[PDB]
Amino acid sequence: KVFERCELARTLKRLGMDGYRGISLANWMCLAKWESGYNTRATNYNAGDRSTDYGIFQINSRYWCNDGKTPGAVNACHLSCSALLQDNIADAVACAKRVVRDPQGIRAWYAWRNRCQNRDVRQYVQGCGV
């Protein structure tokens, strides 16, 4: 599923993402935008280490979910990477929450540090009624 901007904003809000561990919705939106373009089907194979980034938040198989094919990885979210490719983003949100509970928080995502950190992200939630 490829979400419309505000559709995603509200979806994330209903899933308890607004201010989760201090992260505003606008930040989550900016991350999903640059990670997948709001596409839950997005996948990126990393030939270097044989891991794959899955879904709307582009969560990596090396540490966060299990896909079997990544040589010896871990599964911190305790989910099949398949769960991160569903139209329903509840499982991806739960895993995204798990990622931010770590020290770095949302800084875990390089794209957030580069494209969202200390930026005017208001435009991600404007008009969405969130």
Which residues belong to the active site?
A: 35, 53
**Resolution in angstroms, to 1 decimal, for this deposition?**
1.8
Q: How were these coordinates obtained? A: X-ray
Write down the domain spans for the chain. 1-130
Smallest CA-to-CA distance from 108 within 118, 125, 96 is with 96
Torsion of Cα atoms, 17 then 36 then 59 then 111, to 10°: -90
How far apart are the C-alpha atoms of 16 and 93, rounded to whole Å?
Answer: 9
**For residue 120, what are the CA distances in angstroms to 27, 30, 58?**
10, 10, 22
Half-sphere exposure of 19 (CA within 13 A, CB side): 1
Contact (Cβ atoms closer than 8 angstroms) between residue 56 and residue 40:
yes
**For residue 3, what are the CA distances in angstroms to 86, 112, 113?**
12, 19, 23
Q: Does CATH number 1.10.530.10 belong to domain 1-130?
A: yes
